Structures are given as structure tokens and as C-alpha cells.
Amino acid sequence: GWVPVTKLGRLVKAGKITTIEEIFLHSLPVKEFQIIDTLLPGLQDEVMNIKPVQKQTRAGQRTRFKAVVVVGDSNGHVGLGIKTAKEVAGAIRAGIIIAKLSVIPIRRGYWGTNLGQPHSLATKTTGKCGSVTVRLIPAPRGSGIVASPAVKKLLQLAGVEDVYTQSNGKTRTLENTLKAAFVAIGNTYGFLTPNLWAEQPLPVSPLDIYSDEASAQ
Amino acid sequence: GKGKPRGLNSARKLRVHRRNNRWAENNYKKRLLGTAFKSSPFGGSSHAKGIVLEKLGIESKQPNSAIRKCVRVQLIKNGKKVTAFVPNDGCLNFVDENDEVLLAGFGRKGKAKGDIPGVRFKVVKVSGVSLLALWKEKKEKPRS
Amino acid sequence: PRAPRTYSKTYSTPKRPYESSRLDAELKLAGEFGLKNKKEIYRISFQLSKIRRAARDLLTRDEKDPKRLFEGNALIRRLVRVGVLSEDKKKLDYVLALKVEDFLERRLQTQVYKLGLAKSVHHARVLITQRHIAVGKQIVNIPSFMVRLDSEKHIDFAPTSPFGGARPGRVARRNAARKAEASGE
Amino acid sequence: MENDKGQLVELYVPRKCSATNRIIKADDHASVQINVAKVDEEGRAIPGEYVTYALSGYVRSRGESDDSLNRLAQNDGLLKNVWSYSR
RNA sequence: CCACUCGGCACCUUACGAGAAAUCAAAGUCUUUGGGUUCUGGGGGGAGUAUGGUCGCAAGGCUGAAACUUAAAGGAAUUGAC
RNA sequence: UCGGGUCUUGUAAUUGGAAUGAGUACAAUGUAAAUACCUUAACGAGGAACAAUUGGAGGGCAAGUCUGGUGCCAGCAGCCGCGGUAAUUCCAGCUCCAAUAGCGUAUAUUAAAGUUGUUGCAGUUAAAAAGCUCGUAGUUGAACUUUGGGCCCGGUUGGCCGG
């Protein structure tokens, strides 16, 4: 049994929040991966890289392991986590955890018409990390993912079906590339379109409707 | 504005700028000066024939110590003396001197660290005979 | 000095040669459909590529244009005639979600096995290439025949073939002749 | 965003800012949502009825959220004689 | 001295933004890539060498190669072991 | 519990009855005459040989934690390269991989190359702002010179109908 320590966490444990769309709606900082695990039960991780790094720690040459892990729904919820640890499997597990924490949604949209489900993205987007820039362009239906297999796998863990990609910079260093692609798919909920010009009233948080609950006793 | 003209009546400056800056490439300068037609030993061809003048025990020292098996040839089409590598035969038992040899190109980049050479050419045929099928023992070599 | 007779290629080499997911998917297709070459997959990929290019370059033109409606109806009707595209999906948008298995299911290769005329897909290709199967009256022995929809109610055995008609084959009457001679002997 | 059936196909509608009307995204933690309490005739706050404001992390980080919230309050009649539109 | 205004040489913060980084109020408004315009570079050597032209009393300057050779040469930042 | 059937594997150079063209060939078609093709009497396989090859098995890049020899022609050879009684890396065998009537190699070109950049490069320190200014050709060049309103006409889609 998991006990929370945060009042977001004991809201999530109380069954008072159903989806993460409240948390995504209210820009909340998450600090409990159990929230992500209880709200994304069909969240499927995948390791991207495990690599031994040789440390020099207080006259000791040792071997730790850098694990770059991506978690991701088959719908539009992605997460990236990079972790160095003394063991392989501990680095795997804590990289999974860090990817559970940094889950962001995506806005996958249409190309051209308005039929069925959104398959491609909704606009062009761009992410940068290091010198790696990744540019995402919408694609017609059934065109696959034109991307390098790391980036392609990070997009397959998003439910992005159709996208053209172009990069620039030294894309050899794959963690800069995955971070830049992660920024590019995070910025899709960041570009204001005319179909979202409609003024909306500000809804209240769960922090005050459920303020009498979930307080530290 | 990015250090180049953008005026709508300025195509001339742009194309003169490109024709001046394409001489800084490698393939363009070799290609439009007729470099291969003048100084390359094949004269701009994919293969060549020649006559063996010598067998050579070239030495590759550092960091790999090996005894390279090569052949000094004089080409028939040019009168050009070219050394070339011959693979897979420790004895060079399919090669004698004063034989005719079909040579091709060979892309080994030798090092400067230990004066190891990469000669430019490999031996494809000796005396008309496929050197591979000699070494794989599928044909026999007429010995003159 | 004549008319230089035209021709073309039909398959397409994939871009990267060793790509484990692609190798596994291609081999799953070959196992489900009884192929022999990767080129037999690359052919269907190339044809689907040309169809998708025609589609996505007709999509950029606005509707109520005669070129778009004309060539679109030609393409859609031609796909419906072979049963690759279904009846409800008669729009340009649904031909882009149309995949390779939809083509590969419409082969004579496949339709012999799927009508219950063979025991195996491999046995289906075998009965094709040994000249046992006719469509209407004409005998077909290419497995890539790509059965049009209206031709489905005509696939049967041939009147030439011993399974469908005339006298048993070489091995059968050879063994019958050896039996009759040995009973005489 | 909707489909051809006219039903909406998005995960969530984002909150927009109020000072600059831009999108408050799912991880803007420097942004801020403000509640101001509706008062009674006696000057008691109504417990569950607020007027809300949204002040994004760019707005708040630039050093403008005070002045902009003064503007929004006086334009909504919560201040008076504070925010002057001419300077 | 106080308050304002131009026009300078410099300073000091930050980062909204940029950059690989040191850093930058420009080295910003650049993949969401276009204000105008001049010049320059295309891995390292060979080599600013050879030749030709031109300028000069001279010293030299400007212009300026190829053959050949090679998997690095680099720029910034980071740690502690002789 | 036994065993009652439904599948699907693996083998067992275990067994069974089948199918058919490569090839040969009466004939006929074919053709100026032929050869070949499409037809077709009569033969034509367990196929232990009607025998599928070409390049690989460190990484790039799919495939060996396998055995022997080498280790005086050998840590080796597009690139990086890694032990030497004990090698995933030389030679051979077994096994496995890729495409398959085709596979490899050399040369050239294109893509990858946003390393020629109009789209679309870079110039503080990584290559590169002439020592500075004048100035001709070239390129580029502030704003402003009938707005607004009203009338009628008939189209080509969409609905509210369906006549």
C-alpha cells in the first residue's frame, strides 16, 4: 500500500480526480509518480539507451550506467527520463520513474480534412536542445513516421501516426536529440490557433473544491 | 540582411557569386579542370592493364606490423609505372613477372603515423584469369 | 531505327538494408501469404506508393474541379472493381489508410485458399502453377492474378485438370497400368 | 478541434492568460491563478464564490503581474483610483 | 545641487531571447528561417610555396596554384590521478 | 487419473498414394521458308544429384558465449580497430544471416549535403570583416494625387423543400 505525502497525491488516492486533464489544465507540478501510474494504467515504457560510464569518485575508478528511458501511452502522453546509477537495473528503474514524472500531453491533429480521428499533428513545431533542432511537419494519413528510429520510437509512444521530420546539428548525441524532439512535441500545446480564440471562463482548481479533504491532519 | 543581396533585379550578382564559390569544392575543381584526363594514372577509367616489372615486399610498420605484398607494373596504355596490391595470395603463386594484369581501384587510406602506405590499386586479373577463382581454385592459370 | 519500345521497373529497393522490425514484418507477410521473394512485397509497396502519390497530389486541388472528380472517380472505381477498397470507403481520404495486406489478400494465390479449394496457401500456389485452376473458362497459372471482385464467382477447377474433369494424370494412369500388368502377370 | 461528426476531439482546452491572452500550458509553474473573494453587504467574504484571474509565467516573471492585476481589478471594479490608463 | 532633454565613451545587472560554451542590450527580434548592401570561407598540410601579371631603385607588396600526402587538426567547457 | 476428440509444431535420408513442367517428341499451328512460343498423342522425379548461388556473422549493420589449426606470411586491410596457450575480429569445418536467378567489385553521378545554401550556410574565440575613408558602374530607395454611399441586374454552390 502506497501512502502519499502530497495533497495532490492524497487527492489522487481519494478518487477525487479522474484524468490528468485536470492536472494538465491547471499547470500543476507533480512530484509523485504513483499519480501517473494510477492515472495512466496503459502507460508503456521503453528503454532507449543503457551505457556504462566510468566515474572517478574519490580515488575510485568505478562503472555506473546512464539509462535514457521513454515512457509513453499509445494515446498522446509522453515522458522522458535520464538517470545515472551504480547498477544497470537501478538506472533502468529510476529512469522509468523520472520519465513518469516528466509526462506532457500532445495535440495531435489533422492534415487537410476533418474525418475520423486526428492522425497527424495540428501545426508545425520545433524543439531545440544542444545544437539538435527537430522540426515536425504534418503529414497525410497513412504516411508513417519519417524519423530516425530513436525519434520514431518516441513518436510511436505518442500515438503520432503521420509526421515529417527534419533535424539539424550533431544528431549523433542521442539524448540531445530525444530532448529536442520532446520539446517539439511539448510545444504543440503551445501555439495558439484561430479555432482556440474562443474566450473561456477560468475554472476552479481541485485544490479548493476539495480543500476540506486532502489536508494534512 | 544576411550579407548577400536580395534585390529583385540582382540575379547576376548571385550567379556570379555561385560560380566563384564553387571552385572551393573538391569534386567540381577536379571535374571541370580535366584533372583525371591529365595526371591520374588510369587516365579516368575504371580498370587498366599492364605488365609486371617487379614483386615488392613493402613494409607496414606502425601500429600494424605486416609485410605488404605488392607488384610494380608498367601500364600498357600510358607507359606509366604504378605499384599495386595483390590480395589473398601469401605466395603470389599465381603471379610471375612480365605477366599482364588487369588492375582496378582500391580505397585503403594508409596512415602517416608509421609510414604505412595505402597503394591505390588492387589486382583483379592475371594473364586473363580471374584471381579470385585462382585463389578459390575454380580455374587453372596458363603460365605464360 | 524504330520506336524504342518502352518498359519500366516494378519493385523498389528499400532504403536501409538491415532493419529488424521491417525484416520481421516482411517475413510475417511472406508466412501468411506464401511468397518467395522480398521483391514480391516490394512490388506491392511500389504500386501502393504510386497510388498514394496520385491520391495526395489530387488532394491539394480544391473540390468541384473536373480533373479531381474525374481522376478520383476513375481511381476509386478501379479500386472497388478488385475489392481492395470497400463499398463504404469510396472517398479519396480512405485510399490513404489502405494498406498492403488489403492488396495482398486479393490475389489468386490467396483467393484459392480462401474459397476452400486448397488445403494450404502453399498448396494453393501449387495448384495454381500446375495448371489446375480456371477463372470462368480461361486457365490462369500466375499467382499474382489479383482477382477482380466480379471474377470471384468463377474460380474453379479446369476441365483439362483431373481434379475438375478429364482423365487422371501421368503418375495415376502409370500406377494403374502397372497394377493392370501385374494383375495380368 | 472537432471531427466531421461535429464532436470535439481534444484532450483538454488550455487555460489562457488574462494579462496577455496567451496559453497557459500544462507545465507553466511560474504562472498563477488568483481568487478574489466576493464580499457581502456587511463586508463578509462569500465562501464559494470568487472572481478568478490568470497571470502567466511570462507576465509574472517579467515583473508586471502587480500592475496588470491592478488594471484587471479596477476594470472589474475591485479597485478604484489606482490604475491610470494614461501615463 | 535637483528635475528633464538630446548626442557620446564606458560600466553593472539580469534573460525575455541567443549561443557549443565562454559570453552577448547585441553576437537579440533566425526552421515561426526575407529591411538594404559590400567583402570573405568550405577538413589538415604541401603553401601564401611554384609560375605569370602588376607596383617599387631596392627591400618587398598585391594577385596566386597544382602534383603529392593524410583521419584528424581544431574551439569551448570539465574534473583530479607523477 | 485413465482417456474422449480439435489444432499446431518438431523430427524420424519412416512410409503412402498424388500433381506437374524442365527435357525428348508423332502431329498440328506458326512463318517467305524455317527456329522458337501458344496447343497436343507417347515418354519424362523420391527429386541419397532433373542437387541455387553470391557475399557475410566485432561495431556501423541482420547473423557464433561453436570447434580445430594458427599465433616463424601472423592484431588483420573501405572506417574504428581489439590477444597472442586460452582470439565473438586471421585459415578451415559446422551453424547462422541477407538478397535470391541473381549477387559482389572498380569508376562516374545523384541522394544523404542546410559540406555551395534563392528557398537555406558560416565569418568574437572553431576556416573567413580588406588598415581606414572618398567614390563610378551595379543593387536598393520616405509619404501623398476618387474615398465613401445608394440603385438595379443576372449568375454557382449550399440549405427549407421535393414538383
Q: Please, are residues A8 and A28 in contact by the beta-carbon 8 Å criterion?
A: yes
C155 falls within a domain: yes
Experimental method: cryo-EM
In chain A, what are the domain boundaries? Answer: 1-105, 106-199
Task: Look at chain C and report how many structural domains it folds into.
Answer: 1
Q: Do A208 and D4 touch (CB under 8 A)?
A: no
Does residue C97 belong to the interface with chain A, where contact is any CB pair within 8 Å? yes
Per-residue cell: C171? 503418375
C96 falls within a domain: yes
Architecture of domain D1-87: 2-Layer Sandwich (3.30)
For cell 481434379, name the residue: C163
User: Which chain A residue has the Cα nearest residue C19?
Assistant: A149
Measured between alpha carbons, how far is C4 from C9 in angstroms, rounded to an integer? Answer: 16
Question: What b-and-e string marks burial along A199-213, b requiring 16 or more CB atoms within 10 Å of the CB?
Answer: eeebeebbeeebeee
Q: Which residues pair with A105 in a beta bridge?
A: A77
Measured between alpha carbons, how far is A20 from A27 in angstroms, rounded to an integer? Answer: 11
Nearest nucleotide to C38 (CA to C1') is F99
Q: Is C84 exposed, middle or buried (0-12, 13-18, 19+ CB in 10 A)?
A: buried
SS3 content of chain D, % helix, strand, coil (to 5): 20, 30, 50
Does residue C99 belong to the interface with chain A, where contact is any CB pair within 8 Å? yes
Q: Please, are residues A14 and A214 in contact by the beta-carbon 8 Å criterion?
A: yes
Which residues precede a break in chain A, with C-to-N distance above 2.5 Å? Answer: none
Q: Is A157 exposed, middle or buried (0-12, 13-18, 19+ CB in 10 A)?
A: buried
List the B112 CA – E50 C1' distance (angstroms).
Answer: 25
> Which residues are CB-contacts of C162 (< 8 A; sequence separation ≥ 6)?
C168, C169, C172
C5 falls within a domain: no
Q: Which residues pair with A162 in a beta bridge?
A: A120
C6 falls within a domain: no
C50 falls within a domain: yes
C11 falls within a domain: no
Measured between alpha carbons, how far is B137 from B123 in angstroms, rounded to an integer? Answer: 17
List the C10 CA – F32 C1' distance (angstroms).
Answer: 39
Fold (CATH) for A1-105: Double Stranded RNA Binding Domain (3.30.160)
Question: What b-and-e string marks burial along D13-40, b requiring 16 or more CB atoms within 10 Å of the CB?
Answer: ebbbbbbeebbbbbbbeebbbbeeeeee
Q: Please, are residues A134 and A151 in contact by the beta-carbon 8 Å criterion?
A: yes
Measured between alpha carbons, how far is A71 from A97 in angstroms, rounded to an integer? Answer: 9
Q: Do A115 and C98 touch (CB under 8 A)?
A: no
Q: What is the resolution of this structure in A?
A: 3.5
In chain D, what are the domain boundaries? Answer: 1-87
Chain A nearest C-alpha distance from D2 (Å): 7
A-B interface (Cβ pairs under 8 Å ≥ 3) = no
- Spell out which residues of chain A touch residue C99, defining contact as CB-CB under 8 Å: 142
Classify domain A106-199 by CATH number.
3.30.230.10
Does residue C53 belong to the interface with chain A, where contact is any CB pair within 8 Å? no
Measured between alpha carbons, how far is A204 from A62 in angstroms, rounded to an integer? Answer: 51
Bond before C66 cis per omega within 30 degrees: no
Q: Please, are residues A114 and D3 in contact by the beta-carbon 8 Å criterion?
A: yes
List the C33 CA – F88 C1' distance (angstroms).
Answer: 36
Per-residue cell: B121? 590499386
Q: Which residues pair with A52 in a beta bridge?
A: A65
List the C138 CA – F35 C1' distance (angstroms).
Answer: 28
Q: Give kind and range of the element (H or E) at residue D4.
A: none
Cβ count within 10 A of residue C10: 11
D-A interface (Cβ pairs under 8 Å ≥ 3) = yes
* Structural domain of C40: 17-185
Cβ count within 10 A of residue B37: 9
Q: Do D50 and A29 touch (CB under 8 A)?
A: no
Chain C nearest C-alpha distance from A142 (Å): 5
Q: Do A27 and D53 touch (CB under 8 A)?
A: no
Measured between alpha carbons, how far is B27 from C71 in angstroms, rounded to an integer? Answer: 45
C-A interface (Cβ pairs under 8 Å ≥ 3) = yes
Strand-pair category, D45-55 with B66-75? unpaired
Measured between alpha carbons, how far is A118 from A111 in angstroms, rounded to an integer? Answer: 8
C36 falls within a domain: yes
Q: Do A116 and D11 touch (CB under 8 A)?
A: no
> Which residues are CB-contacts of A216 (< 8 A; sequence separation ≥ 6)?
A7
Q: Do A142 and C99 touch (CB under 8 A)?
A: yes
